[PDB]
Motif scaffolding. Structure first.
Motif, short mmCIF file in Angstrom:
data_model
loop_
_atom_site.label_atom_id
_atom_site.label_comp_id
_atom_site.label_asym_id
_atom_site.label_seq_id
_atom_site.Cartn_x
_atom_site.Cartn_y
_atom_site.Cartn_z
N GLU A 96 41.66 31.93 47.88
CA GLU A 96 40.22 32.12 47.94
C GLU A 96 39.48 30.92 47.37
N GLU A 97 40.20 29.81 47.16
CA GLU A 97 39.58 28.55 46.76
C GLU A 97 39.92 27.45 47.76
N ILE A 132 31.43 31.58 51.34
CA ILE A 132 32.66 30.81 51.21
C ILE A 132 32.50 29.40 51.79
N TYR A 160 37.63 45.04 51.96
CA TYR A 160 37.96 43.62 51.92
C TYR A 160 39.04 43.41 52.99
N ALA A 192 44.77 35.66 44.37
CA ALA A 192 43.43 36.19 44.55
C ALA A 192 42.40 35.16 44.10
N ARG A 193 42.81 34.20 43.28
CA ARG A 193 42.01 32.97 43.21
C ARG A 193 42.70 31.69 43.67
N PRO A 206 41.39 27.16 51.53
CA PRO A 206 41.65 27.91 52.77
C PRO A 206 43.10 27.82 53.23
N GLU A 209 28.33 34.58 47.50
CA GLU A 209 29.21 35.19 48.50
C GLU A 209 29.72 34.13 49.47
#
Lengths: 62, 140, 37, 549
Positions: free
Chosen positions: D292-293, D243, A38, D288-289, D295, D241
């Motif tokens: 990743e939601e 994004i 990652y 990590a969320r 940008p 996957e």
RNA sequence: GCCAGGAGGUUGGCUUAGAAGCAGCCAUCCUUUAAAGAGUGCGUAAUAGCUCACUGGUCGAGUGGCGCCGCGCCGAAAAUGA
């Protein structure tokens, strides 16, 4: 967690893929890092261990 | 439409930009101030620079016109008495010296700009303005 | 300033007006709104 | 109250360079609204009420008419900057065909020229249908938008065509969370047909993709469609996957990528530090969320200090992201002020005795080093000299006696930080065979340096930034004010275009969250870039103020 | 009090990112003139503007300042009711 050697960035997350294998260094070296994962994607320019050291297929366009 | 606006400025030779307040004064004009730059630079080609006044106008249908004037006397003495930037403070340090011919031409050049458009005052006039920049004098 | 024992003319555009019993110092900008107090 | 024409009109060619030709004029200012005239197709669509259950379109109530007329004329005459029929028509005094209006206008409109200020009122349903018609008249169709730019599978130009037969080639945007059909991707395709229940593949990081069901947010309820068309817009299910901004072609579809690369550049820097760092990597799952939601922001840790800097572009931005934290992620972190990268040095020539007159077991390890130390400009680098008075101290210490100098430098005499930007020098020493080691004179160097820096006129060189201010003259005067009020002094002012940028010096500690400020003084003309220059002393009081314990 | 002129070298030099009468050191002019300063305040990003200085037009009788002496006024709030 160690690393695959030369050419790192990593900062502080990366998802360092806990791997496994000590050496005569760092009283641990267990559960390494992988590059590609990652984060990391290997050495900036690698010509062999691209099985861990990220780099895809050196398509030097010539 | 825009009817008549003759705005005069203090634009020195070298700067070829429409930077304000040249903007909010000659925008309501349609100013050909890029022709003012390239026609006045050669107008004083013997040096090609120095700070010079200007005057520009619009004739309703967008019609510029450039009116130039003459150099400053503080610069026309740094060239004459050979100062670099000057004589650091008018009341302590002095550089070159003014006598009875250099000041003559400092007044000559700037005949129709000083104040008294008459020679028989100008010499001692800016010779006194000389002590204001700090350049010493030789008196006979 | 504004309420105090010592009250000057500070800025020339001020006046000392012995109004309602006691000394004031009035102007335009009432930031010098002095007063003998 | 405040509703007007001239208002906005005027403010269009004074705030940009807009060319607002307009086509509709209201009936009755404030409270007295009842309809609009249409100087476009020459009508007067009037809404005889608020809720809009019963409207009309009678002619002018006597007083308007000719008013609107002048503006109608304007239109045609303005249309003398396009074709050659409308112009010559105004020459003739000829009546515009109701559709050449549609022409010349939509022409300039899509060509970015004219400014169809159709207008109205919402809460009192007045002026809606006219602009619906005006969307169905002057709002560009995909056919009109010029060839999209993009990359190839190899690398050059793209030609993303409208053609509903070509290679599958999509883009997608919004990352939708949802119960039933889970991850939902909001997309605008571009070029290529896509079937529902079929397959595709991510033309970005290489990922085969299974389209589940194409969908369309149809106002009230969402509708599932048979397929997505080459130039339409839709949101699909699956793609576990993909994004955002991912170019999505078909299973084949010559693996083509797109050009567009945007920038949500950083402006805010707020510090954040949990109680114990156990809750920290916890909040790292939170990120990590989070990263990743949305940008945008950059969760990057300053080197010199701990604590990950949550950087982003907006005051309310980081503030509300912080709301979401203690809300549904619940983190206890006394949201702190960002720290600074503190270095240091000295200001004088010092000469001391670095004598390690110490025998122990017999092996000694003793080192009398004799250094002269010299200091030099804030910006030079590091200097020492191959400085032997003749040939005393061994040549094995030359690449090691300086180490302990460079070593006793990672922590200064004060609070202690990397002491950089100094020359050094040396000059002499004392030597012996067995009673002398490498690390011995390394350590002798260490002692010498501690003494020669503690007794060398201390200082702290806090870092300072060059910041260009992106703003016109008004609030420029104002912000010259601000920046001056921020312990620094600017230096820079080269006249710019639609603004006037000011190159500034500001002390990094100060200027903190300057965006939170700035965006207030200028109301929002722009801002600044974070160009980092170099460091210099804090004014005496700011030094001893940090001498804590 | 009112009308008006209130100027030119000039952006004094020195500093300073800029210091233009006007944030600061020195200074410490000369001239067109009846009169207008190397400036007194406000204001400016620094210019700009406003502005006082100064001198005429009107005016029509007193006016401006510096020190003293006597009495006062602010300075000046604590506790059962004056």
């Amino acid at each position: 967690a160690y690393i695959p050697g030369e050419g790192h960035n990593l900062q502080e997350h990366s998802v360092v893929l806990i791997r496994g294998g000590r050496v005569k260094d760092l009283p641990g070296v267990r559960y390494h890092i992988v590059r590609g994962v990652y984060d990391a994607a290997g050495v900036k320019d690698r010509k062999k261990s691209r099985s861990k050291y990220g780099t895809k297929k050196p398509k030097e366009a010539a | 439409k825009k009817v008549v606006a003759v705005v005069k400025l203090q634009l020195p030779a070298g700067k070829a930009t429409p930077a304000p307040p040249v903007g909010p004064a000659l925008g309501q004009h349609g100013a050909n101030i890029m022709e003012f730059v390239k026609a006045f630079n050669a107008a004083t080609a013997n040096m090609g620079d120095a700070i010079v006044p200007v005057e520009i106008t619009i004739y309703a249908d967008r019609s510029f016109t450039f009116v130039t004037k003459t150099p400053p006397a503080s610069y026309l003495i740094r060239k004459a008495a050979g100062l670099e930037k000057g004589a650091h403070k008018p009341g302590r340090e002095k550089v070159g010296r003014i006598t009875w011919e250099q000041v003559l031409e400092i007044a000559k050049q700037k005949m129709p700009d000083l104040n008294t458009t008459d020679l028989e005052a100008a010499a001692r006039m800016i010779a006194g303005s000389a002590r204001s920049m700090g350049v010493e004098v030789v008196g006979a | 300033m504004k309420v105090r024992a010592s009250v000057k003319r500070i800025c020339d555009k001020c006046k000392v007006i012995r109004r309602h019993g006691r000394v004031y110092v009035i102007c335009e900008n009432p930031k010098h709104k002095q007063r003998q107090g | 109250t405040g509703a007007d024409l001239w208002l906005v009109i005027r403010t269009m060619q004074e705030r940009l360079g807009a060319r607002p030709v307009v086509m509709q004029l209201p009936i009755g200012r404030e409270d007295t609204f009842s309809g609009i005239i249409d100087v476009l197709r020459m009508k007067a669509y009037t809404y005889g009420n608020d809720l809009g259950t019963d409207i009309r379109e009678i002619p002018i109530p006597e007083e308007y008419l000719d008013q609107a007329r002048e503006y109608h004329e304007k239109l045609v005459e303005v249309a003398a900057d396009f074709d050659e029929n409308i112009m010559l028509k105004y020459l003739e005094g000829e009546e515009p065909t109701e559709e050449e209006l549609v022409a010349a206008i939509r022409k300039g409109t899509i060509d970015l020229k004219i400014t169809p200020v159709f207008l109205g009122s919402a809460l009192k349903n007045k002026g809606v249908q006219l602009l619906l018609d005006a969307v169905v008249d002057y709002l560009p169709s995909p056919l009109d938008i010029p060839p999209i730019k993009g990359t190839t599978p190899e690398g050059e130009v793209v030609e993303i065509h409208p053609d509903p037969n070509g290679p599958l080639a999509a883009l997608a945007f919004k990352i939708m969370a949802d119960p039933y059909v889970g991850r939902l991707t909001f997309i605008r395709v571009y070029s290529g047909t896509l079937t529902s229940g079929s397959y595709v593949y991510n033309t970005t990081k290489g990922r085969k993709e299974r389209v589940a069901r194409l969908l369309r947010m149809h106002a009230n309820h969402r509708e599932e469609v048979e397929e997505l068309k080459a130039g339409d817009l839709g949101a699909v299910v699956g793609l576990k996957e993909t994004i955002t901004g991912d170019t999505l072609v078909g299973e084949d579809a010559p693996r083509v990528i797109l050009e567009s690369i945007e920038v949500p550049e950083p402006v805010i820097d707020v510090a954040i530090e949990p109680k114990t760092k156990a809750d920290q990597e916890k909040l790292s799952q939170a990120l990590a969320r989070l990263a990743e939601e949305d940008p945008t922001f950059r969760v990057s840790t300053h080197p010199e200090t701990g604590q990950t800097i949550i950087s982003g572009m907006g005051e309310l931005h980081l503030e509300i992201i912080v709301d979401r934290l203690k809300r549904e992620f619940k983190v206890d972190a006394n949201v702190g002020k960002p720290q600074v990268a503190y270095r240091e040095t000295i200001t004088k020539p010092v000469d001391v005795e670095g004598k390690f007159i110490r025998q122990t077991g017999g092996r000694g390890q003793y080192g009398h080093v004799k250094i002269k130390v010299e200091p030099l400009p804030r910006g030079s680098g590091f200097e020492f000299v191959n400085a032997i008075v003749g040939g005393v101290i061994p040549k094995e210490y030359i690449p090691a006696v300086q180490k302990g100098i460079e070593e006793a430098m990672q922590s200064g005499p004060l609070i202690g930080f990397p002491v950089v930007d100094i020359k050094v020098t040396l000059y002499d020493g004392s030597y012996h065979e067995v009673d002398s080691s490498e690390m011995a004179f390394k350590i002798a160097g260490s002692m010498a340096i501690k003494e020669a820096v503690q007794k060398g006129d201390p200082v702290i060189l806090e870092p300072i930034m060059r910041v260009e201010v992106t703003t016109p003259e008004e609030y420029m005067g104002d912000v010259i004010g601000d920046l001056n009020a921020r312990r620094g002094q600017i230096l820079g002012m080269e006249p710019r275009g639609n603004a006037q940028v000011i190159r500034a010096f500001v002390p990094l500690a100060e200027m903190f969250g300057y965006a939170t400020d700035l965006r207030s003084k200028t109301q929002g003309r722009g801002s600044f870039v974070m160009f980092f220059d170099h460091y210099q002393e804090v004014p005496k009081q700011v030094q001893e103020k940090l001498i804590k314990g």
